[PDB]
Design a protein around this ligand. Structure first.
Ligand SMILES: [Cl-]
Ligand SMILES: [Zn+2]
Length: 261
């Protein structure tokens, strides 16, 4: 496809390895670039953890309003919300909101712990049919993206399918699916990533991520005008450990998709 040649050219000029999956829910067609290669997830795994806690809340009444103690030992690499609550509490809803909308790493670690560790997040992935996602570590090590290391990786194909199931399908209950979509739509970190490659009138929920090896990621559900929603995942990582983040490459991938399909 013309899209696949533009994505190959984008990668060639990019200084890294690019992975893209787009699902068009109008006809359930898929466009993939390196769609079955593993990529480090970095912050984008926060969507799985928040979703897994939402699933817990379907049978545990008021779980989202349960206070969770924030302790000094919980603070990790980026704690914009939790660092205002040490020796206080945050509810699981507030922790999910902080992880998703501010990428709060302490909040992520509280969610992972609420699920019984990284295996609990992975078990939720398996329960909703994702055989590929794996979470192996916790913050701050989730931000380390060693090339070839399969820990804390997924494939673009699998993340797009899972994101679709969570936000547009039936993986979650109706109230929970709406809450996840609301959280994603209120993300504060995405202005320079997929959103920067889309028409401003299209509605977007997204979760970015970044880590070392210049790893720069974003996963999005898009509601265009005039057509059915899209699910777009863009993963990018580079050969040098201290490579610079390339949110602009993800914006380019989003523009190719927005204009070519
Ligand atoms: Cl992370
Ligand atoms: Zn992190």
């Amino acid at each position: 496809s013309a899209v696949q040649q533009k994505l190959a050219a984008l990668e060639k000029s990019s200084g890294g390895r690019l992975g893209v999956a787009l699902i068009d829910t109008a006809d359930n067609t898929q466009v993939l670039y390196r769609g079955d290669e593993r990529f480090p997830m970095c912050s984008t795994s926060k969507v799985m953890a928040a979703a897994a806690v939402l699933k817990q809340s379907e049978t545990q009444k008021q779980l989202l309003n349960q206070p969770v103690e924030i302790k000094p030992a919980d603070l990790v690499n980026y704690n914009p919300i939790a660092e205002k609550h040490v020796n206080g509490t945050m509810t699981l809803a507030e922790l999910s909101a902080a992880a998703l909308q501010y990428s709060d790493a302490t909040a992520m670690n509280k969610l992972i712990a609420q699920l019984g560790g990284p295996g609990g997040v992975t078990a939720f992935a398996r329960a909703i049919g994702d055989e590929t996602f794996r979470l192996d570590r916790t913050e701050p090590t989730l931000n380390t993206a060693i090339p070839g290391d399969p820990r804390d990786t997924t494939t673009p194909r699998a993340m797009a399918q899972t994101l679709r199931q969570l936000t547009l399908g039936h993986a979650l209950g109706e109230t929970q699916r709406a809450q996840l979509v609301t959280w994603l739509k209120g993300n504060t970190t995405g202005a320079a990533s997929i959103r920067a490659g889309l028409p401003t009138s299209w509605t977007v929920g997204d979760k970015t991520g970044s880590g070392d090896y210049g790893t720069t990621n974003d996963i999005a559900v898009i509601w265009p005008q005039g057509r059915a929603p899209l699910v777009l995942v863009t993963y990018f990582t580079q050969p040098q450990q201290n490579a610079e983040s390339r949110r602009d490459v993800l914006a380019s991938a989003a523009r190719i998709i927005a204009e070519g399909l």
